[PDB]
Design a protein around this ligand. Structure first.
Ligand code: HEM
Ligand SMILES: *[C@@H]1O[C@H](CO)[C@@H](O[C@@H]2O[C@H](CO)[C@@H](O[C@@H]3O[C@H](CO)[C@@H](O)[C@H](O)[C@@H]3O)[C@H](O)[C@H]2NC(C)=O)[C@H](O)[C@H]1NC(C)=O
Ligand SMILES: *[C@@H]1O[C@H](CO)[C@@H](O[C@@H]2O[C@H](CO)[C@@H](O[C@H]3O[C@H](CO)[C@@H](O)[C@H](O)[C@@H]3O)[C@H](O)[C@H]2NC(C)=O)[C@H](O)[C@H]1NC(C)=O
Ligand SMILES: *[C@@H]1O[C@H](CO)[C@@H](O[C@@H]2O[C@H](CO)[C@@H](O[C@H]3O[C@H](CO)[C@@H](O)[C@H](O)[C@@H]3O)[C@H](O)[C@H]2NC(C)=O)[C@H](O)[C@H]1NC(C)=O
Ligand SMILES: *[C@@H]1O[C@H](CO)[C@@H](O[C@@H]2O[C@H](CO)[C@@H](O)[C@H](O)[C@H]2NC(C)=O)[C@H](O)[C@H]1NC(C)=O
Ligand SMILES: [C-]#N
Ligand SMILES: [Ca+2]
Length: 595
């Protein structure tokens, strides 16, 4: 191999060795190997990278060069021919709330982020990629095929910059390109507390010794908090309505404002922290701020794991859950906690669960005003609809009352995502998330579909008839091969999502496998898992088993009617109960009795 230790912005420090608290960076989780699982290191590889030049050039870069003998089809074309649909009727998941979608994006943002290459602060490279669609260094444009309506209207391509890689970020050359993960691999609520020490400090309110998180001083939501505005300008959130001039929210993660519902749950998590921090002061008045913040931070993270593994994963993986995530047996120092590259694509199954509209409901769960129901596209980087149009209560009710989009082989990704995506850097509402994913798959050097089928010990179709049988769909199998020419070349993202769903889950055989393995590893390899003996006490754990998202809603909003089981489609009011019927989190076990 080569250089068993490359790396940059890898910061400060080494282990307090006996501290009861996680680092912010993720360091010191594992003792023998302290960097394992930290932020700003390469995504792990379960299989060797597959580039056009075996080193870094993505398949589809140089156009005389084929992959296994054939030209790779354009990203946008695979989007246009296989991913899109018009009829939004009957596309909803009859047994999964919109919260099911939303929680996936959170967990996801807790685990991974491969940021786009920068080297662009007063640059025209950003422009050479935007204005001329010139493929070059880090610019790897998504061209439009002939007859694409976007030609007549936007340009010749959609800009697109490659993701960042390890040793440097400028050119480089020596070995195989590995993409960076800028967040910690552990399910540790980093999307709330940050993954950098610098950032994590800024988010805190270090004026009062109460272990609180910095909150907004310009706007309030019925006496309830809002995360602070981010003051970098230009601001994406400002651009979408210059008259309101409302900036994006500032949070542990940089994506918090990407879409209105993600910002919403970001606020719930911010509010639960401060809530905990002051409930913990009540009980332990001697405690100093640092201890409040840290104990609060520990409880909250405990919260995100419990919800994720008890309530979310079982209805995603389904009958495939037990196969991959057997019951807990304690921490295993030999297990690699790092998020694999391919995961960052397998976990994108969620993109096909995002419905076309977002609704605001009143106190009786009725349409909130004349413009209650909004197009998803008008909500990307939209924070003014929250601050200036209702607060989060109308949105939380939407989450609870409305359905997610069911994945459908004939209706994959909604046009609001496939045709009208807003990107922070740019100005237009016309990017394609489906096309970007596909392009990105090649950017990261993903192996194909069959290499992954194999990895997981499933069959590897080689023929139109073979794919037919796997996909249980003739027309899909036919469209897929007309474009890819062989099942070997199909991109992991679309290839994985095209499979029929497993019994009682929301993904198929190949996806269940990739997702399962990863989640089994972050749990078995995390020294601070909430169930691991020593982290919490008998008594503390016992109380933690009682948490639920419904409760999270009750303590932190003015919604008084909620479902018991928030992840499944619930109807109002039959399925809704009073918050007073919902198990609370008993923090008595956190009291420290003296002398
Ligand atoms: C708008 C977007 C969403 C909803 C309205 C949305 C939703 C999800 C869900 C529900 C996911 C999982 C259950 C999920 C996973 C991942 N996404 Fe993501 N998403 C919206 C928009 C975007 C955009 C834009 C990107 C950037 C893609 C790129 O490569 O440039 C994006 C990415 C991802 C992603 C990769 C994260 C990473 O490792 O960098 C997921 C794992 N989503 N989305
Ligand atoms: C940009 O953002 C502003 C919000 O700052 C949006 O303006 C809002 O527009 C509506 C009407 O178009 C105003 O509401 C009106 O009055 C009452 C509500 O009290 C209602 O009953 C009426 O039917 C009507 O809807 C609202 O007050 C106004 N907000 C302000 C203070 O300007 C605007 O629509 C956004 N424009 C863009 C570019 O999206
Ligand atoms: C909508 O999704 C619901 C959420 O998963 C689902 O509820 C699930 O119902 C089954 C009932 O069979 C439960 O699974 C267990 O049931 C019994 C225990 O009574 C066991 O003997 C079984 O082996 C199995 O372990 C789940 O507990 C329950 N899921 C959750 C998370 O609550 C509904 O059935 C779905 N509704 C429709 C219409 O399909
Ligand atoms: C850091 O922590 C500070 C201490 O909690 C916090 O200051 C407090 O801010 C609240 C809310 O803005 C104020 O409480 C309320 O005051 C009257 C009620 O008497 C209301 O009319 C207000 O609207 C408000 O809800 C307190 O006045 C204030 N506490 C003190 C003693 O100054 C800071 O806001 C926190 N800083 C950040 C950036 O989050
Ligand atoms: C911790 O997990 C590891 C990793 O799976 C397990 O290690 C296995 O150990 C056996 C010998 O006992 C070897 O044959 C395999 O190489 C390992 N499994 C694989 C495929 O990685 C181990 O079971 C766990 N250790 C403890 C103490 O629970
Ligand atoms: C994710 N966006
Ligand atoms: Ca994390």
């Amino acid at each position: 191999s080569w250089e068993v230790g490359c790396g940059a912005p890898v910061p400060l420090v080494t282990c307090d060795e006996q501290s009861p608290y996680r680092t912010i960076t993720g360091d010191c989780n594992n003792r023998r190997s302290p960097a394992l699982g930290a932020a700003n290191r390469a995504l792990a590889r379960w299989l060797p990278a597959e580039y056009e030049d075996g080193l870094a050039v993505p398949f589809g870069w140089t156009q005389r060069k084929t992959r296994n003998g054939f030209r790779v089809p354009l990203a946008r074309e695979v989007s246009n021919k296989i991913v899109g649909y018009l009829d939004e009727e009957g596309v909803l998941d009859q047994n999964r709330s919109l919260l099911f979608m939303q929680w996936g994006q959170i967990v996801d943002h807790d685990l991974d982020f491969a940021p786009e290459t920068e080297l662009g602060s007063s640059e025209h490279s950003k422009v050479q990629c935007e204005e001329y669609c010139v493929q070059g260094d880090e610019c790897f444009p998504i061209m439009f095929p002939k007859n694409d309506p976007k030609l007549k209207t936007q340009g010749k391509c959609m800009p697109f910059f490659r993701a960042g890689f390890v040793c440097p970020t400028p050119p480089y050359q020596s070995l195989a390109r590995d993409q960076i993960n800028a967040v910690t691999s552990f399910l540790d609520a980093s999307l709330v507390y940050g993954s950098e020490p610098s950032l994590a400090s800024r988010l805190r309110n270090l004026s009062s010794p109460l272990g609180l998180m910095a909150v907004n001083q310009e706007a309030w939501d019925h006496g309830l908090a809002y995360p602070p505005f981010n003051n970098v300008k230009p601001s994406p959130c400002e651009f979408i309505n210059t008259t309101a001039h409302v900036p994006c929210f500032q949070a542990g993660d940089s994506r918090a404002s990407e879409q209105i519902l993600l910002a919403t749950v970001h606020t719930l998590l911010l509010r639960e922290h401060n809530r905990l921090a002051r409930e913990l002061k009540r009980l332990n008045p001697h405690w100093d701020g640092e201890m409040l913040y840290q104990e609060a931070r520990k409880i909250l993270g405990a919260f995100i794991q419990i919800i994720t593994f008890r309530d979310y994963l079982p209805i995603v993986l389904g009958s495939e859950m037990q196969k991959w995530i057997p019951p807990y047996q304690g921490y295993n120092n030999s297990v690699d906690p790092r998020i694999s590259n391919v995961f960052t694509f397998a976990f994108r199954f969620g993109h096909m669960e995002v419905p076309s509209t977002v609704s605001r409901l009143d106190e009786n769960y009725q349409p909130w005003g004349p413009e209650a129901e909004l197009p998803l596209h008008t909500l990307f980087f939209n924070t003014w609809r929250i601050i200036k149009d209702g607060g989060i209560d109308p949105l939380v009710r939407g989450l609870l009352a409305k359905n997610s989009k069911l994945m459908n082989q004939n209706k994959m990704v909604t046009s609001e995502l496939r045709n009208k995506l807003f990107q922070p850097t740019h100005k237009v509402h016309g990017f394609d998330l489906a096309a970007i994913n596909l392009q990105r798959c090649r950017d990261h050097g993903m192996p194909g579909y069959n290499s992954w089928r194999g990895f997981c010990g499933l069959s590897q179709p080689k023929t139109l008839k073979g794919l037919q049988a796997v996909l249980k769909n003739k027309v899909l199998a036919k469209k897929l091969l007309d474009l890819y020419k062989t099942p070997d070349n199909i991109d992991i993202w679309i290839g994985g999502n095209a499979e029929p769903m497993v019994e009682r889950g929301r993904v198929g055989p190949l996806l269940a496998c990739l997702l399962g393995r990863q989640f089994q590893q972050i749990r078995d390899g995390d020294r601070f898992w909430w169930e691991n003996p020593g982290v919490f006490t008998e008594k503390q754990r016992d109380s933690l088993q009682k948490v639920s998202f419904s409760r999270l809603i009750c303590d932190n909003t003015h919604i008084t009617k909620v479902p018991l089981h928030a992840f499944q489609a619930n109807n109002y009011p039959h399925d809704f109960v009073d918050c007073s019927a919902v198990d609370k989190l008993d923090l008595s076990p956190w009291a420290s009795r003296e002398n």
